Design an enzyme around this catalytic site. Structure first.
Site, PDB file in Angstrom:
ATOM      1  N   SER A 215      94.727  82.451 -73.869  1.00  0.00           N
ATOM      2  CA  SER A 215      96.061  82.544 -73.296  1.00  0.00           C
ATOM      3  C   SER A 215      96.466  84.045 -73.369  1.00  0.00           C
ATOM      4  CB  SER A 215      96.992  81.605 -74.096  1.00  0.00           C
ATOM      5  OG  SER A 215      98.269  81.625 -73.575  1.00  0.00           O
TER       6      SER A 215
ATOM      7  N   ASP B 193      96.300  75.460 -64.804  1.00  0.00           N
ATOM      8  CA  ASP B 193      95.765  74.606 -65.903  1.00  0.00           C
ATOM      9  C   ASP B 193      96.866  73.935 -66.682  1.00  0.00           C
ATOM     10  OD1 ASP B 193      96.871  76.591 -67.462  1.00  0.00           O
ATOM     11  OD2 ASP B 193      95.042  77.209 -68.517  1.00  0.00           O
TER      12      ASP B 193
ATOM     13  N   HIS C 294      95.044  73.962 -70.322  1.00  0.00           N
ATOM     14  CA  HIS C 294      95.397  75.099 -71.176  1.00  0.00           C
ATOM     15  C   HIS C 294      95.228  74.746 -72.647  1.00  0.00           C
ATOM     16  CE1 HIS C 294      96.934  79.160 -71.325  1.00  0.00           C
ATOM     17  NE2 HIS C 294      97.778  78.809 -72.298  1.00  0.00           N
TER      18      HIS C 294
HETATM   19 NA    NA Z   1      99.078  79.606 -76.690  1.00  0.00          NA
END
Ligand code: NA
Ligand SMILES: [Ca+2]
Ligand SMILES: [Cl-]
Ligand SMILES: [Zn+2]
Length: 386
Positions: free
Chosen positions: A111, A315, A356
């Site tokens: 991320s 995502d 994610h």
């Molecule tokens: Na994160």
């Protein structure tokens, strides 16, 4: 075949915490297990970093540096003065003091961890001219981090990183939804948001801002204060760096080092609709994203400000197009993986049909062999020529 002996260092995004936090539920493995442990057990020496989840990339880069080499976090006299927070954060013993002596690392980041990692390399290579001039002019000390001419990162791998930002930031009620995302992650770790825990549980590491969850205060009530605090309202935040706008500004100065391999993994978990080709969440996407985040990401367009159909695949948290490496405001080069990894450029390792949170195991996905994924990755990194 193994070509280098650099250990791996794991680096989280806008959520994340140490191995002792969250009662030991791992950001890196969540419900599937413990990714650091798998890698160690297969002979790939691996450490985990823990930096301010909501803090700016700069801040997190400075925290990462001290965590690695040892010592007190130093945000830079000029930066601290400009943004209104302490110069000095906490003190670490140093996971890898050998980095001062020629040791190196592979950084695997998720991320926004991916922005922080790129920023750490850029700071090590070039330092900060602003910090150098300010120190000279005000006669204060200067962190070696800001001098430049340092090098200790052999590779950066990024996984589902918003290199060009995420349009999620432009959502209405982004503020409330984002802290609800923090609450949904506490829930996946089986942690309540309405209980005033006396143990720390999840330290936001906001020493520089003077912020800390209080005795008798729940996460709900804490987050309501955070929303109103500089870690949410200033430009020195994860929030700002996460927007298409902040991300581009970051890319203006954070470039690829010629001395470092860059690897990017992209994620997607949506299907194309039959109406206007909006994107919608697939089955099995983590529930918070599927309900709250994915519909927005898969439909929000801005043909003026770059955002067209290529941005709709997501995502659940990040636009898939943002992930293969920085492009907006960037002169970095991105090449598709061709079976040889090259230094100095983004080797786009392909797109995976994982969301994610699934890519780090925080949401289940039994068709995803997360153990094989991270082992295959450790082995490629161990093959890199130094
Ligand atoms: Na994160
Ligand atoms: Ca799932
Ligand atoms: Cl406080
Ligand atoms: Zn700062």
């Amino acid at each position: 075949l193994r070509a280098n002996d650099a250990p791996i260092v794991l680096l989280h995004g806008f959520t994340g915490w140490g191995r002792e936090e969250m009662f030991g539920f791992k950001y890196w493995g969540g419900v599937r297990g413990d990714i650091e442990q798998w890698l160690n057990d297969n002979g790939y020496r691996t450490y985990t970093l823990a930096v301010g989840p909501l803090s700016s990339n700069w801040d997190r880069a400075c925290e990462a540096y001290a965590q690695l080499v040892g010592g007190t976090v130093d945000y830079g006299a000029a930066h601290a003065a400009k943004h209104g927070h302490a110069r000095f954060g906490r003190t670490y013993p140093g996971l890898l003091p050998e980095l001062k002596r020629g040791g190196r690392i592979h950084i695997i980041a998720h991320s926004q961890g991916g922005q922080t990692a790129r920023m750490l390399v850029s700071l090590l290579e070039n330092g900060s001219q602003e910090e150098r001039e300010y120190a000279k002019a005000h006669n204060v000390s200067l962190s070696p981090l800001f001098e430049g001419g340092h090098h200790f990162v052999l590779s950066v791998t990024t996984i589902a990183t918003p290199h060009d930002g995420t349009t999620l930031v432009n959502m209405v009620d982004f503020t409330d939804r984002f802290f609800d995302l923090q609450k949904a992650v506490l829930e996946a770790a089986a942690v309540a948001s309405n209980v005033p825990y006396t143990s720390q549980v999840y330290d936001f590491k906001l020493d520089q801002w003077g912020l800390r969850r209080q005795p008798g205060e729940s996460f709900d009530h804490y987050f309501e204060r955070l929303k109103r605090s500089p870690v949410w309202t200033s430009t020195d935040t994860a929030r700002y760096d996460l927007s298409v706008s902040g991300a581009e500004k970051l890319n203006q100065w954070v470039q690829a080092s010629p001395n470092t391999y860059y690897l990017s993994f992209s994620t997607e978990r949506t299907y194309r609709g039959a109406l206007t080709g909006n994107h919608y969440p697939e089955l099995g996407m983590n529930a918070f994203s599927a309900v709250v985040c994915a519909p927005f990401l898969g439909s929000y367009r801005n043909p003026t400000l770059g955002i067209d159909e290529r941005w709709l695949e997501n995502d659940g948290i990040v636009n898939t197009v943002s992930m293969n490496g920085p492009k907006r405001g960037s002169s970095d080069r991105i090449v598709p993986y061709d079976g040889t990894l090259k230094k100095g450029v983004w080797n786009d390792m392909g797109t995976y049909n994982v969301d994610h949170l699934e890519i780090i195991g925080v949401d289940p996905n039994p068709s995803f062999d997360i153990r094989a994924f991270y082992l295959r990755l450790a082995e490629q990194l161990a093959s890199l020529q130094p």
